[PDB]
Tab-separated table of C-alpha atoms and ligand atoms in Angstrom:
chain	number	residue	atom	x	y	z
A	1	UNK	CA	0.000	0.000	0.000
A	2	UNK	CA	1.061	3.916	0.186
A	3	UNK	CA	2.526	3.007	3.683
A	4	UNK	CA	6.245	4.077	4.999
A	5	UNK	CA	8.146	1.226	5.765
A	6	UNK	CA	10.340	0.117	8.789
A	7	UNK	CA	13.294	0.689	6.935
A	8	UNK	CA	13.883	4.691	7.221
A	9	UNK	CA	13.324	4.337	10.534
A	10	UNK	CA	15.973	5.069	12.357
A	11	UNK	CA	17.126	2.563	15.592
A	12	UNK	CA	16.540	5.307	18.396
A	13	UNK	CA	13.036	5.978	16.212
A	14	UNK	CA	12.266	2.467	16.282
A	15	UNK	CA	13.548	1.917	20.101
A	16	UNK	CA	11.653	5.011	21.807
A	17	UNK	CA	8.646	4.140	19.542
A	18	UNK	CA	8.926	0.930	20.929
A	19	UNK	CA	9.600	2.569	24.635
A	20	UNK	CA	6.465	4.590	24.109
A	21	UNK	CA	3.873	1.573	22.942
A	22	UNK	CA	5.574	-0.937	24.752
A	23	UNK	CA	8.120	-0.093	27.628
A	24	UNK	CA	6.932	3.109	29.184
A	25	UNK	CA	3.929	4.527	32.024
A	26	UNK	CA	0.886	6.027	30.750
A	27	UNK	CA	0.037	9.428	32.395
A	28	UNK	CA	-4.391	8.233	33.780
A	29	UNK	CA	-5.787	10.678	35.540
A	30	UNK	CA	-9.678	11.282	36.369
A	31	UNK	CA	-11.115	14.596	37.873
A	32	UNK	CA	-8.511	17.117	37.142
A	33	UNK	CA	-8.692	20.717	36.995
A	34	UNK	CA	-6.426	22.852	35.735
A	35	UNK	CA	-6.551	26.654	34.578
A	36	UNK	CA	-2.852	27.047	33.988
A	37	UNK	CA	-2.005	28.360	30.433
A	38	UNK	CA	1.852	27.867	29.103
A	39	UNK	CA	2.306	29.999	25.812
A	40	UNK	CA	-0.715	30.756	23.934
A	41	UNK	CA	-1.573	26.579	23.185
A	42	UNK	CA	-0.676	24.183	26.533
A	43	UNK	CA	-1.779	23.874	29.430
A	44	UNK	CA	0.149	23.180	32.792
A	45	UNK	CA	-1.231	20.689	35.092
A	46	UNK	CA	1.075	22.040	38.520
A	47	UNK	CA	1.449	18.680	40.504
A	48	UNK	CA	0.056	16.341	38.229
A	49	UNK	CA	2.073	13.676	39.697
A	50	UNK	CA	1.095	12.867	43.409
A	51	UNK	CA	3.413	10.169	44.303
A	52	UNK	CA	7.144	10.543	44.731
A	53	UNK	CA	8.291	10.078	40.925
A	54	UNK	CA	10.815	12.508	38.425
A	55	UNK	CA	8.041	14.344	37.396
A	56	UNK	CA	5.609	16.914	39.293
A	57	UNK	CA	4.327	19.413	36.457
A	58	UNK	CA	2.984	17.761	32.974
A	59	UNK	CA	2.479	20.011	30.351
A	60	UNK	CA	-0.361	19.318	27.415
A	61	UNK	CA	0.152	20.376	23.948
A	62	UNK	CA	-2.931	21.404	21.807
A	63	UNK	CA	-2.951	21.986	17.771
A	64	UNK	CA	-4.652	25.621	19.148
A	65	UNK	CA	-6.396	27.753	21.669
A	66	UNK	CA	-9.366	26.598	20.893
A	67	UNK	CA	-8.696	22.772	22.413
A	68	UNK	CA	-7.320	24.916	25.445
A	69	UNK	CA	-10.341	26.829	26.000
A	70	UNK	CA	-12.935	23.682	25.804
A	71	UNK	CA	-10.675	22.189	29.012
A	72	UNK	CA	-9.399	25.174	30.827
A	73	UNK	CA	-10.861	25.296	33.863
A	74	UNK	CA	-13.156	22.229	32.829
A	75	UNK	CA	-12.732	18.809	35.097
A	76	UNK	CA	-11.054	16.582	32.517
A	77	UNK	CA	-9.858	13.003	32.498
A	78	UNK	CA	-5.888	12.178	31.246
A	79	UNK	CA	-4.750	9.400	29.523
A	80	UNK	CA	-1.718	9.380	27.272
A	81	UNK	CA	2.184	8.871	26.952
A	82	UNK	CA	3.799	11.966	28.866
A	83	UNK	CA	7.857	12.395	28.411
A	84	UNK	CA	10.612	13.642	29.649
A	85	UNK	CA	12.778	14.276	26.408
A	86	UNK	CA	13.204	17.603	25.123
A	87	UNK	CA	10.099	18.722	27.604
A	88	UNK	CA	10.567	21.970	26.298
A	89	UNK	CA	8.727	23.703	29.604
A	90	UNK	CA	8.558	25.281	32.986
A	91	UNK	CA	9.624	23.540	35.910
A	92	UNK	CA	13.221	22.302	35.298
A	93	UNK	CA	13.722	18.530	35.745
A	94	UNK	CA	10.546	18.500	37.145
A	95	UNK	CA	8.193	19.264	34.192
A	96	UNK	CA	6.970	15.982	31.874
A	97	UNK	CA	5.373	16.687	28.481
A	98	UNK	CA	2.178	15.230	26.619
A	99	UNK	CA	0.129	16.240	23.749
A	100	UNK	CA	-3.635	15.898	24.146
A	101	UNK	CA	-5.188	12.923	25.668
A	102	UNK	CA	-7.685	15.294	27.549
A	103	UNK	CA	-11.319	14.120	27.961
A	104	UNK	CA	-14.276	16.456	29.017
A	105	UNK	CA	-14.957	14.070	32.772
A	106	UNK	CA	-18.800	15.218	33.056
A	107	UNK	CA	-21.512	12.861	31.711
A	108	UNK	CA	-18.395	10.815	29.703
A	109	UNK	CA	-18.431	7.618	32.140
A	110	UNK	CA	-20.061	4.896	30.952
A	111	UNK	CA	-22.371	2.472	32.963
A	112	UNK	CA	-20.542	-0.503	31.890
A	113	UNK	CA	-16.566	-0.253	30.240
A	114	UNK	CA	-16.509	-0.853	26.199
A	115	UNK	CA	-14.198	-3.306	24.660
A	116	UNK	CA	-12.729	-2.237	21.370
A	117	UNK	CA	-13.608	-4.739	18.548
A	118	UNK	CA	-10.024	-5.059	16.509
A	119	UNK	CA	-10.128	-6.569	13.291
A	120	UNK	CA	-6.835	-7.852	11.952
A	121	UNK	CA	-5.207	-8.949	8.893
A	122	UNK	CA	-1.536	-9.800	8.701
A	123	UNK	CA	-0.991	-10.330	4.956
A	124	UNK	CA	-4.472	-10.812	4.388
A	125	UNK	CA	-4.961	-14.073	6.717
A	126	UNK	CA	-7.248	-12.267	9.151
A	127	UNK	CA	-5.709	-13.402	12.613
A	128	UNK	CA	-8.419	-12.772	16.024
A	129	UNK	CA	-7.663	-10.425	18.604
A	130	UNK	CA	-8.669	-10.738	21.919
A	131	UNK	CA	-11.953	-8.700	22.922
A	132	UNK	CA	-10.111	-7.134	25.855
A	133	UNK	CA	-7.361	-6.067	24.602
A	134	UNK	CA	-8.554	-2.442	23.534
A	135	UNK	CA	-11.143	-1.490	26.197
A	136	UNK	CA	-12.263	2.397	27.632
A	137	UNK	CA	-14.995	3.678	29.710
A	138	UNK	CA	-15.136	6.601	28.283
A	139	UNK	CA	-18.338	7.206	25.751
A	140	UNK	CA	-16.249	9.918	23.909
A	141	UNK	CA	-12.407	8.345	23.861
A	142	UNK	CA	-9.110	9.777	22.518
A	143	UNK	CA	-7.755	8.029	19.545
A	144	UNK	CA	-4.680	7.985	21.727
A	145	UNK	CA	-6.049	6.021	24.741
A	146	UNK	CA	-7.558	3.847	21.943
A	147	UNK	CA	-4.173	3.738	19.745
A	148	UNK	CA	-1.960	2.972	23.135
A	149	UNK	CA	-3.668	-0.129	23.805
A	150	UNK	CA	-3.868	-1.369	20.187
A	151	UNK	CA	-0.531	-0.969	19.664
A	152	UNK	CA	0.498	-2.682	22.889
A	153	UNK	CA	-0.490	-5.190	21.622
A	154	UNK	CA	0.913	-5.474	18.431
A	155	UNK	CA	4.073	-5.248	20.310
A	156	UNK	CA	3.348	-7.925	21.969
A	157	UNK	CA	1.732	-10.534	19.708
A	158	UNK	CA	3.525	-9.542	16.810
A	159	UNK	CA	6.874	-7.475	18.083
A	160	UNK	CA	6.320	-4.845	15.643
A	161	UNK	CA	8.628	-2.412	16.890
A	162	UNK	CA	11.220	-4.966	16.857
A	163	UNK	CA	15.103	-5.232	15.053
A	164	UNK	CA	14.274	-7.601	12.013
A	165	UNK	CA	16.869	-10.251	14.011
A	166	UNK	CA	14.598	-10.521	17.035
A	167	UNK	CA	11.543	-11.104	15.164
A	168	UNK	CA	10.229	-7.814	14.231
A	169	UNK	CA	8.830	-9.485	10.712
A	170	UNK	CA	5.794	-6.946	9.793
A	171	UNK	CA	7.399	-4.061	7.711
A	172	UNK	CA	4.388	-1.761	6.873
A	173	UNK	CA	1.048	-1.471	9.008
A	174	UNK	CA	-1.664	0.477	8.943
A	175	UNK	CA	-4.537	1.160	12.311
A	176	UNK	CA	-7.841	2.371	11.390
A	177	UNK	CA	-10.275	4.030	14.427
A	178	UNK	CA	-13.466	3.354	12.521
A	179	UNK	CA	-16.022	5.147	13.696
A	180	UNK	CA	-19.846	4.762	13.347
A	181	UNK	CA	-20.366	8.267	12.224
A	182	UNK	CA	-17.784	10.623	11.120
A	183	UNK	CA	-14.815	9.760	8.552
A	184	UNK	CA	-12.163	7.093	10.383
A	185	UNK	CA	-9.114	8.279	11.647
A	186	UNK	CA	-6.236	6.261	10.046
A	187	UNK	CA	-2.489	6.084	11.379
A	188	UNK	CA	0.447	4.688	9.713
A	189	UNK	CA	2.173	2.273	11.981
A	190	UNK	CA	5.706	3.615	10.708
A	191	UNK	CA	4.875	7.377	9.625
A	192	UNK	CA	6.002	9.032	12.581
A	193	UNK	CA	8.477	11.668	12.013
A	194	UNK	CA	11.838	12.072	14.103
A	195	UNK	CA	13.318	9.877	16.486
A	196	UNK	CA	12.297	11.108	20.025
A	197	UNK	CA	9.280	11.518	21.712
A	198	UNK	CA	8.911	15.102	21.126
A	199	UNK	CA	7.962	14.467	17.946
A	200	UNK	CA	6.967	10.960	17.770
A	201	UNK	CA	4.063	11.709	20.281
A	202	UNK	CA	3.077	14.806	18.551
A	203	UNK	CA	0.998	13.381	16.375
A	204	UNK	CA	-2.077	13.205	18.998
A	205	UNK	CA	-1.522	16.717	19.441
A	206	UNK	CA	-4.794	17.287	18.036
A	207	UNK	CA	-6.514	15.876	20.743
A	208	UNK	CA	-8.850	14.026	18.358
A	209	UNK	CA	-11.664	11.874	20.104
A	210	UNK	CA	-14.279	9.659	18.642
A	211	UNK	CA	-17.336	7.701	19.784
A	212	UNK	CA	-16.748	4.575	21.662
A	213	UNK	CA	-19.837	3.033	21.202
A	214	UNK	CA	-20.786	1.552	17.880
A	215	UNK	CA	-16.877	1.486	16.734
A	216	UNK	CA	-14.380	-0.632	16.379
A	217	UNK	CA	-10.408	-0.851	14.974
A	218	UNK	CA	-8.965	-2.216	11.943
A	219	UNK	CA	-5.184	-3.440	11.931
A	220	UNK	CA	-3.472	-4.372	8.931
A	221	UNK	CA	0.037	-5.968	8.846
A	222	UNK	CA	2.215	-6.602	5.992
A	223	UNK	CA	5.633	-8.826	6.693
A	224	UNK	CA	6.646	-7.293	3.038
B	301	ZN	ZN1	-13.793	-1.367	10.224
């Protein structure tokens, strides 16, 4: 297909890709208020963090303003990969960085959690995914708390984000959040651009989120 392939990435792209989806601690978070503004597009979430970890501050990145202004001040739900790489913010050492992955908390929570329906095709033979494996409570759900779990799992089950010599076989993949109403949102396994999280993750910077009920994911793998 019109996919990027594996080769062209390079091996940090392909390691913190596979730190991201794979290795690393999503930032959950329910209930939170923030009306902190950083530079005209972010907002700062001042002791996010309430254990005893590297991080106390996370800072969200929004495409604009107008993102900002539906959560600022609004009780919103996180859920997301936050880093610490080239957090350019704030507070030191101290301040982790994420791009979207905001939810609106009111009215959102659903009565009983939705599992995900993930169709998949590795070079056509269409293998079965587990009915758990992408799951969210949420009735309106970012395409990143969906896309974190799918590709979990790909890491898993099919070590996608893996050096050809340890069994990283698929080459070119494509995920598809269809949706049961507006035009799905399709991501290119491998068309990520740069090599660090700053970058990688800014992709969900849109803060794009779709139904959860009536919707499900398409996978498709190619070992080619
Ligand atoms: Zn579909």
């Amino acid at each position: 297909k019109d996919l990027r392939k594996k080769s062209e990435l390079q091996g940090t792209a392909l390691g913190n890709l596979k730190q991201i989806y794979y290795y690393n601690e999503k930032a959950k978070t329910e209930n939170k208020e923030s009306h902190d503004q950083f530079l005209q597009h972010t907002i700062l979430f001042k002791g996010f963090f309430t254990d005893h970890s590297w991080y106390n501050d996370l800072l969200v990145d929004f495409d604009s303003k107008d993102i900002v202004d539906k959560y600022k001040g609004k009780k919103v739900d996180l859920y997301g990969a936050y880093y610490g790489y080239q957090c350019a913010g704030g507070t030191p050492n101290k301040t982790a960085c994420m791009y979207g992955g905001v939810t609106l908390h009111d009215n959102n929570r659903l009565t009983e959690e939705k599992k995900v329906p993930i169709n998949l095709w590795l070079d056509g033979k269409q293998n079965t995914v587990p009915l758990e494996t992408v799951k969210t409570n949420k009735k309106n759900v970012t395409v990143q708390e969906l896309d974190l779990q799918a590709r979990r799992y790909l890491q898993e089950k099919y070590n996608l984000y893996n050096s050809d010599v340890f069994d990283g076989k698929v080459q070119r993949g494509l995920i598809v959040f269809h949706t049961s109403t507006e035009p799905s949102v399709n991501y290119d396994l491998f068309g990520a651009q740069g090599q660090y999280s700053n970058t990688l993750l800014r992709i969900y910077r849109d803060n794009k989120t779709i139904n959860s009920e009536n919707m499900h994911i398409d996978i498709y793998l190619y070992t080619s």
